């Protein structure tokens, strides 16, 4: 059974070569035998195979314009209808872009000349999905195709990505957002984009050398992009009794939206509160 | 006259050494003779000098915990009051973090041992300011100091920075946000953080190889973080008559907030609209 997994695969480093698609499938690199995109709307896309599937595709080594799946005649191999984001591979690729999930590019024999191998399939490491759009198909302008921009991840801490087995844990984010359904714990909204709901996982006690916060569900809030910014730059704090308070003027906003399977560790809350200029004293709210 | 300028300075590459602070000042690297931070709340901070100014400072080469300016007795050289964000250097450093402006680190003789030079002052290239907080001073815990986390920029397109002379133009962003006063052109709000107002500059026709958008004031909108996300992932478009429309359901939101010195080039609007799955036809709104 294939297990969908983001990041490098144990045993198969960047550079690894394979003879055909069944190899790649057995190794755990892709899910599929023919299909270009390994992915699902719910979970994200963990790999793509690039073997000149459309003539819209462009390959610049470190940059890739990848064209999506859908709307081909099985017999003709010619576009007969528009591409959409119901396609799990197309949807999964957008969901990778939004969650910042890295995508294993596996490059194939038949593709663009300088970067493709002469024969077989090489695994060329992880790329980040940056944007997506629709354009007109080159061979048949009356039909729309979906397209993605992919950029090579050179340093994993630099580009902000999340991976399954470590860098920051993908699982942690996915739990917290899943429990809340991408609703901001402060203002209640869900940001709706083309593919679906959108939110940001925001650590309460920051990660790294100085602060040493754990990367876990208890040290994280699901927030909208606006509230993330406020929260990280002294405009919100949370009380011991889980009220959200405007740090700039002292005014109490309202209660934090809680979920029973999501246990916020109050030590981390206290720590975050303690990064403000004047620590809120007893009786402040 | 010193001109405050973000990024590398012509003639002084990373590695450049100098004998004392007056040299650094003449070269154009810093603004000041003693003061650690070159910077202002309005414009941002373009440099810091790191010469063991506080014992709270930590130096890890690629990471730096820098401690801010303020609250010292001129005679004693000991902390006598709390640090605040009225200090132009402290404020400027937060404003650098928010605008994503790179900061020239110049490292000094008296600092942390492995990374400091043996004598003089070396220019160690650009760093990005990532976060800031307040903590207790080591020598006098009853007083608060301001602190910053700085990370070395290795690739300038990767870390998302904006520089004065080119990468993306800092001037372009600064104009657009200045004309609008960090108000979202879609929803009207200003995000207020500790140091002041906050917004995002959002190109209308994206930059780079595929789309080839210009990096100019006419191809950019000032937006709140929430609306930026919607705008880049098929949830908003703008009409020829400058109304904002919800791309998901077709519903018209309201008119775009315009400013007379900010001329949006309608070709770019049309281009952005044309990235949606079905291009809006005549009579759509
Ligand atoms: Na954060
Ligand atoms: Na953008
Ligand atoms: Zn919110
Ligand atoms: Zn807005």
Author numbering:
A (entry chain A), B (entry chain A): 2 to 167, 193 to 311
List passages from the publication reporting this PDB structure.
The crystals diffracted to 2.9 Å resolution, belonged to space group P4(1)2(1)2 and contained a single TagI protomer in the asymmetric unit. As predicted by the analysis of the amino acid sequence, TagI consists of an N-terminal SRA domain and a C-terminal HNH domain. The linker that connects the domains (residues 168–192) is not represented by electron density in the crystals, presumably due to disorder. TagI crystals contained a dimer located on a crystallographic two-fold axis and mediated by the interactions between the HNH domains. The TagI SRA domain can be described, similarly to the prototypical UHRF1 SRA domain, as a distorted β barrel, which unlike perfect β-barrels has a ‘gap’, i.e. adjacent strands that should, but do not actually engage in main chain hydrogen bonding interactions. In the case of TagI (and in UHRF1), the walls of the pocket for the flipped base are built from tyrosine residues, Tyr55 and Tyr67. The TagI HNH domain is built around the core ββα-Me motif of HNH endonucleases. The TagI HNH domain is organized around two divalent metal cations, a structural Zn2+ ion and a catalytic divalent metal ion. The identity of the latter ion in the crystal is uncertain, but we tentatively interpret it as a Na+ ion. The structural Zn2+ ion in TagI is coordinated by three cysteines, presumably in the thiolate form, and an aspartate.
